[PDB]
Design a protein around this ligand. Structure first.
Ligand code: SF4
Ligand code: SF4
Ligand code: SF3
Ligand code: SF3
Ligand code: FES
Lengths: 629, 629
């Protein structure tokens, strides 16, 4: 088959239905694009930023510079920076909504509550906030402080970066001048820098990308994930069902899909009400069930158990079109990316109702717009259930043939820094000891999307993960790439049998899988808390540790902002497919060869899972040698 | 040669020097790009936003949608929105710095003062601020309030838009749901919407563009321009020297260049110190002179007189490279766009020193980096003078042959709303009356850059302006296109005789030119105050007025954000060259044909000055007919 589909049998089966039904889909749409690809854009040496364009760099024809005078290196890095403004904006958007949700929850106006009060008070103490009064007071103070971190300008020092970053990184960041403003000012400054005839210096633009990455993790991601733990609990390991076989066509099936989990949690709470289960049964369904999709789904499976109501996680963004082709979905409730913009015709064919629950998400053919507001989420969840009941009765039941694949996989979800510490007996020391002894050679943060650019859905990701664990490298996974490993079976105890001799021994002793599900790409900051704890306990810099990062099927700039963060944080950072930079030779040299002498990190490239794994292991072994282990 | 150069003889003379010196320059760089132009990018039907790309729409090869599913209309509007995030970010950056500068001025930490106290107190009254205490206290309160408007979220109502927009527009915006957040949140929301698989609906994306334009004018531009008036005075009409013959090579010559005028004002104040003039003369110069370039220069000529120190405005951004070829510049101090990124080799050849005075501005070969802070601007200005004196002694004097063109033109600069009222005898009535009677058919806001895309520098702008005034249409001008009209002689009293029968006679009686210099593209908000004043005086909506906007040689998205504002504000808005949208037929239909029934405005296109002027006049005459005049 010359069309890239998927490594997953469930997805390939449902692709067959999309193709038989003659519906457009991402897999088929790749092929016409292959007829007319632009290699200037592939290489990052085109520009569309002003009316003297569109420009291309081609020295052979005399087009050495753009009309404005920018060279290839500035051109490529500037467009990378501009796109990374989008990535940072999404994390900043989510953080602000989390903080407003916490405040409105403390004031009594949401269906949520303050669940992890211990985390609330410890965070407040770490940040030197006033902890007098009641938990609701402390929660308002924390929300206002974390909003201040979003809003702080380039000249007001941050506190999150001081609390949560490792000691030896701080001196590097000071030396390089990359301590950022709050993410709102940083992303505005980055966008302004990208306007024509402003910043045309590839080194400066790269520096601004590193700053933007730091602003995203310390100024948005860590705060938002800890606030979500305060609201919904801190994840601990538990068994979850994943893949598209979790659907049963005789129930009313509501799927929540995006990155922000607030609507999903409100849906689970509303679906547990007897009145709503009775509604479903009166409509001819066995009962009402809620399912998670993509990153919003992953946020929930990190913190919530499967039960008779909440059924598990469907898969990553390339599973959404196949999921509709099951003919089992009643409402797909969409809160952020990825909500692909041609779902309308598929929802129509398969008898599903599309509901946007964010002012960000719009595309042709959406049935309902219920933009999120914390004080409205209770009513939003109820209206979604009402829509789903009507949709089941009048659109799907008795009209649509279901075609649900048989595949269901088990994954242990809910790893957090706290869960790792508990699994090790309350101290990081046993992990240090198994690393020093060579049982685990090192650890990889797999923080990733999925894409079709460099293979069938999830091919590189799953095979790279298999190659890493065979080499006794423990994986901490987040993002659509985490969903892939869960569906592939790498996140359960059976997967110990795929690990090498040292890692399989540790996994059996600790009773954990060789791939630890840490959640979403938004959990890059949270994974950094584990690496920071390692660095601080060893009194070594992050750039000295036997670790690496990989985003091996990256798609969008949530992944690349996390990669820029990883570079600033001093790490070997593998990215595939190539970012659009390879036509800019001095930028390539900076990112791949010179950064180890600047931040400590570097970009690595390639899509062959075996070579990528070998190169990661070589870097880990080089770090090990310098540590004497 | 066949190379597009300029309509201005001074620029053509200096281009010859650049070409004979075999130095790269915008004019020559256009020709290689012409060999390899991408028609997909020209039409807005390419996309580089995720790794499944680069994508193209070409139905003839089966490429109907991008891999993700987006159609041509969503693709084109999304990239327009993303680029307009840059435009909004620059205005928001500038506003924030203006507000911090006013605050630090009130606290006594700058070389500036509160010049227009009347305006300070009038704003405080209009915005219902506390006026107790001293003017400095009120200035701090106004600065904090305007910062709040920058930071307001989508769900908190604004006050600037209530005060400074007319009643019928506010009702239209309310009905359409396009009242925006403050510009920081609005630009973050727009950027997040552009991430792959978020907002792929061209109608939604266009709506977001309109919102972004409103947020920019009411949330940043009006506040920043009125704060700059509070600091540096409200412009009134006065004679100014323009074009490149203002240079004299026997003086130490410092040129400030960008959009933010703070460093330029500080330089003028420092150069007026006798000790600094003594330093210049001891170095062998006749004395020390300051000159303005592009939009920062225009802000200064709006509010300051020509004297023995400050000498006038050089021209717009396509004049910067020619200006260096005079061999007369000692320092070029650069604060924002446009600072073209290949000036380094030109500065080296002609013996000029380049100084960046903004963290936004970086490019290869810059000699000194003096990032602006209000509390450091006195030291920055003095350091620049020190650098200039040394550069004159060591790089230029006795080494570089000057080639200064003879051309100097006179322009009347400093028109403001207040200046118009004064010229009319204290009220707007006389202008309304001569419009009603048909002497002046209507008015156009020319808010423009310059570019080479649709002609030699300033060709379309100047010829369009001549055709408009011949048709008895008064022009209020801002931006690089304003600089073009000043240099071409349309902004002095001789230009009265280029106007048609009715407008020439009104201008002769009022002793004003037919093109009124209103400053920068940043003064779109200020122009809207005049258009709003006309709406109220007539008791009609802005969409009913005999007015239009043109950006006839647009370059970057400061101009396009002003055009998006104009559309939201209900106006016929001509833009040339074509924005990168014309491959998206439904988007084109929305912008050019359906918007009149939505906001009242519409996009018009074309670069033929006669046809464009005829079309503007036809619109104005249609509006007149519906008003009964
Ligand atoms: S910014 Fe420079 S390289 Fe990009 S389109 Fe404009 S002239 Fe060309
Ligand atoms: S966002 Fe869609 S159209 Fe753009 S590059 Fe990605 S797949 Fe292609
Ligand atoms: Fe948070 S990872 Fe990047 S692709 Fe869109 S849901 Fe996936
Ligand atoms: Fe403010 S107008 Fe747009 S082009 Fe850059 S200086 Fe000119
Ligand atoms: S698609 Fe236009 S330059 Fe690549």
């Amino acid at each position: 088959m010359a069309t890239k589909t998927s490594i997953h049998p469930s997805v390939n089966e449902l692709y067959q239905r999309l193709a038989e039904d003659q519906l457009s889909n991402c897999f088929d749409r790749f092929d016409p694009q292959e007829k007319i690809r632009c290699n200037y854009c592939e290489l990052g040496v085109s520009c569309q930023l002003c009316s003297n364009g569109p420009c291309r760099i081609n020295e052979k024809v005399g087009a050495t510079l753009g009309v404005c005078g920018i060279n290839a290196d500035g051109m490529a890095m500037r467009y990378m920076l501009l796109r990374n403004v989008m990535g940072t904006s999404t994390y900043t958007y989510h953080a602000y909504e989390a903080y407003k949700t916490l405040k409105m929850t403390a004031l009594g106006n949401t269906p949520f509550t303050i669940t992890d009060k211990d985390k609330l008070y410890q965070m407040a103490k770490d940040l030197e906030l006033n902890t007098e009064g009641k938990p609701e007071d402390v929660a308002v103070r924390l929300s206002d402080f974390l909003i201040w971190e979003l809003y702080r300008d380039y000249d007001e020092p941050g506190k999150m970066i001081e609390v949560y970053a490792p000691l030896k990184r701080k001196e590097v960041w000071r030396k390089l001048g990359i301590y950022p403003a709050g993410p709102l000012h940083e992303l505005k400054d980055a966008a302004a820098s990208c306007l024509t005839n402003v910043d045309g210096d590839y080194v400066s633009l790269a520096t601004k990308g590193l700053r933007l990455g730091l602003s995203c993790i310390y100024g948005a991601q860590i705060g938002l994930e800890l606030v979500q733990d305060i609201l919904f609990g801190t994840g601990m390991p538990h068994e979850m069902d994943v893949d598209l076989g979790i659907f049963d066509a005789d129930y009313i099936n509501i799927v929540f899909n995006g990155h922000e989990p607030f609507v999903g949690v409100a849906l689970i709470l509303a679906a547990k009400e007897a009145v709503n289960q009775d509604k479903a049964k009166a409509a001819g369904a066995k009962s009402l069930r809620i399912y998670g999709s993509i990153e919003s789904g992953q946020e929930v499976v990190q913190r919530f158990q499967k039960d008779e109501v909440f059924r598990g996680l469907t898969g990553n963004w390339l599973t959404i079109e196949p999921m509709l082709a099951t003919g089992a979905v009643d409402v797909l409730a969409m809160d952020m990316n990825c909500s692909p913009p041609n779902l309308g015709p598929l929802a129509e064919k398969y008898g599903a109702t599309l509901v946007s629950v964010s002012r960000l998400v719009r595309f042709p053919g959406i049935h309902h717009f219920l933009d999120y507001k914390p004080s409205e989420v209770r009513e939003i969840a109820q209206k979604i259930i009402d829509i789903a009941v009507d949709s089941f009765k009048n659109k799907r039941h008795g009209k649509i043939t279901p075609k649900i694949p048989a595949n269901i996989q088990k994954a242990i979800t809910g790893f957090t820094p706290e869960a790792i510490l508990k699994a090790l007996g309350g101290s990081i020391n046993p992990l240090i000891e198994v690393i020093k002894a060579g049982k685990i050679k090192g650890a990889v943060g797999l923080i990733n999307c999925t894409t079709l650019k460099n293979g069938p859905q999830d091919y590189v990701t799953v095979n790279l993960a298999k190659e890493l664990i065979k080499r006794d490298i423990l994986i901490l996974s987040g993002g659509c790439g985490n969903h892939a490993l869960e569906v592939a079976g790498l996140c359960n105890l059976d997967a110990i049998n795929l690990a090498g001799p040292g890692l399989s021994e540790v996994c059996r002793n600790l009773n954990i899988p060789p791939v630890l599900s840490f959640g979403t790409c938004t959990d890059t900051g949270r994974i950094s808390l584990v690496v920071t704890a390692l660095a601080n306990a060893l009194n070594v810099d992050t750039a000295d540790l036997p670790v690496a990062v990989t985003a091996p099927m990256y798609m969008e700039q949530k992944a690349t902002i996390d990669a820029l963060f990883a570079l600033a944080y001093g790490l070997y950072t593998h990215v595939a497919p190539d970012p659009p930079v390879m036509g800019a030779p001095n930028l390539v040299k900076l990112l791949t060869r010179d950064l180890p002498s600047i931040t400590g990190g570097r970009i690595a490239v390639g899509s062959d899972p075996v070579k990528v794994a070998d190169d990661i292991l070589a870097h880990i072994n080089d770090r090990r040698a310098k540590l004497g282990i």
